[PDB]
Amino acid sequence: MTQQITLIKDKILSDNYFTLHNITYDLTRKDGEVIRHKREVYDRGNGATILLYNTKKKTVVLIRQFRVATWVNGNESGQLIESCAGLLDNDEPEVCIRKAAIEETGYEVGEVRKLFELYMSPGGVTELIHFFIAEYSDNQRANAGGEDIEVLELPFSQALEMIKTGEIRDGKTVLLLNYLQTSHLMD
Amino acid sequence: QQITLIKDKILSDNYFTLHNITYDLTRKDGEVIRHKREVYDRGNGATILLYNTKKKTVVLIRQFRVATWVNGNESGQLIESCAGLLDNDEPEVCIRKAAIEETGYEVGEVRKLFELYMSPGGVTELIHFFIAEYSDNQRANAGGGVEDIEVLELPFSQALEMIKTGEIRDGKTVLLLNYLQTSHLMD
Ligand SMILES: Nc1nc2c(ncn2[C@@H]2O[C@H](COP(=O)(O)OP(=O)(O)O[C@H]3O[C@H](CO)[C@@H](O)[C@H](O)[C@@H]3O)[C@@H](O)[C@H]2O)c(=O)[nH]1
Ligand SMILES: Nc1nc2c(ncn2[C@@H]2O[C@H](COP(=O)(O)OP(=O)(O)O[C@H]3O[C@H](CO)[C@@H](O)[C@H](O)[C@@H]3O)[C@@H](O)[C@H]2O)c(=O)[nH]1
Ligand SMILES: [Mg+2]
Ligand SMILES: [Mg+2]
Ligand code: NA
Numbered sequence A: 001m002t003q004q005i006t007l008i009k010d011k012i013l014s015d016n017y018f019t020l021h022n023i024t025y026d027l028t029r030k031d032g033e034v035i036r037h038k039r040e041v042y043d044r045g046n047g048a049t050i051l052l053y054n055t056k057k058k059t060v061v062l063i064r065q066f067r068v069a070t071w072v073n074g075n076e077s078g079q080l081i082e083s084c085a086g087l088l089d090n091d092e093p094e095v096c097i098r099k100a101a102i103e104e105t106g107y108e109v110g111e112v113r114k115l116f117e118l119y120m121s122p123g124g125v126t127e128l129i130h131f132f133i134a135e136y137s138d139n140q141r142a143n144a145g146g147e148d149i150e151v152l153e154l155p156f157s158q159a160l161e162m163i164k165t166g167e168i169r170d171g172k173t174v175l176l177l178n179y180l181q182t183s184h185l186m187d
Numbered sequence B: 001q002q003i004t005l006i007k008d009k010i011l012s013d014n015y016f017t018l019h020n021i022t023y024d025l026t027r028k029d030g031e032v033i034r035h036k037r038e039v040y041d042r043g044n045g046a047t048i049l050l051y052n053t054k055k056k057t058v059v060l061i062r063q064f065r066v067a068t069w070v071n072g073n074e075s076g077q078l079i080e081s082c083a084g085l086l087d088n089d090e091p092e093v094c095i096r097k098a099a100i101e102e103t104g105y106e107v108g109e110v111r112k113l114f115e116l117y118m119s120p121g122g123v124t125e126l127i128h129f130f131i132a133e134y135s136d137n138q139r140a141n142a143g144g145g146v147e148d149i150e151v152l153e154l155p156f157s158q159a160l161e162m163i164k165t166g167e168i169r170d171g172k173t174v175l176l177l178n179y180l181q182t183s184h185l186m187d
Helices: A093-104 A156-165 A171-183 B091-103 B156-165 B171-183
Strands: A003-014 A019-028 A034-043 A047-054 A059-066 A079-082 A085-087 A113-119 A128-135 A150-155 B002-012 B017-026 B032-041 B045-052 B057-064 B077-080 B082-085 B111-117 B126-133 B150-155
Touching (some): A113 A171, A113 B171, A128 A171, A156 A171, B045 B171, B057 B091, B057 B156, B057 B171, B077 B171, B082 B091
Antiparallel strands (some): A047 A085, B002 B017, B057 B150
16 A cells, blocks of 8 residues: 555446445555555545533533434444534534534534544545534523434433443444543543 | 335445435334435444553554545555454454454454444444554564555554544544553553
8 A cells, every 4th residue: 555546547336415436546566566456435525523511510412313324234223322413515614513513402512622533434435524522501502403313411421331331332422422531621 | 213114225236335225214203204315335344453561552554545535635544453344254353364464463362342333324334343462472474465554563652642633533543542541551
């Protein structure tokens, strides 16, 4: 995978809703040897996720909704607990995530803290994910956050044992709770 | 709660599989609502962080990832915790084999953290997460080609730094590094 990446072919395998490409690239080695590779690349655009936490109560806000992709893959009920999250669409990550937060969780969020931007599945998915945390309070609650999306308010400690047992099993939701833990913000 | 799969359509089956799934969802009323969702299925995998308590080092890898190349990773090169796809193998057999091919270590004992969905929007993938201690006495070769992957050993203080500089920017690697920290085995 060293150096010299010549792009050779970008074929669209499927462009219904999101896009599936087949990508042909060449890697050229130290000696000048050229090896051809072919890789499916699925482009659903980038996303952002936020973790709402509160230091007055030691609580965090998450959601739960039906994820069909997990229903077809081992998740019996299909419902999944997760940090609030949205696709970028036409929006910068901040705008994206503020709106996402107020549609899904019904909180008007103020100061945010960006953590990192991570690829979640870099083998075959372009998806970059913008991570945020922000503190919440009862003042910031505009509405209810309704889709089958249920808003969960629970102890930070509870959420942590749910990672332990399997009740929480989403990746971006685990990163975020683990970062809040290591941040000390909740102590 | 009540879920019925109506139609599973194959949009692409060139190598991996892209499905367009129609399902009925019964609401908090008894209300039936129909959805269509693209679901990409590349199977599942397993990833392993290798750590040495004596040297306080970790082992990670650097390879080219086309999925990131087309979405913001200039050189396409990406640092990740060793991983492989399941290929009908059990997570532990998989990751044991992944470790020798990619890192050159026949790791002895192995610990299982959890299984997480990495991108539950439209990707099926479930990753099995691992850690295990390593030593030179476990090495045999220096990374082969199942590929030409590069093997980075580095100070575990540096790896954490790189997550903050965004030099490390892969979902499964951050988790792995973050969990190890929280676990304290490195103090
Ligand atoms: N027909 C159709 N509609 C879709 C599809 N995917 C999304 N939609 C529409 O878009 C909505 C989803 O909006 P978001 O809240 O932005 O999507 P999300 O699933 O929460 O996405 C976030 O989390 C994912 C899981 O990690 C991330 O992968 C993603 O980037 C994003 O951050 C759905 O209610 C639906 O109307 C699809 O495959 N087919
Ligand atoms: N033609 C073709 N071949 C492929 C494709 N994807 C993989 N292969 C073949 O399978 C090999 C992949 O090596 P693995 O170590 O088994 O998988 P990985 O690419 O490291 O994937 C791991 O990381 C991904 C990203 O986090 C994970 O999504 C995946 O589950 C796995 O754990 C490649 O060298 C290649 O020969 C594809 O889209 N097309
Ligand atoms: Mg959402
Ligand atoms: Mg690999
Ligand atoms: Na496209």
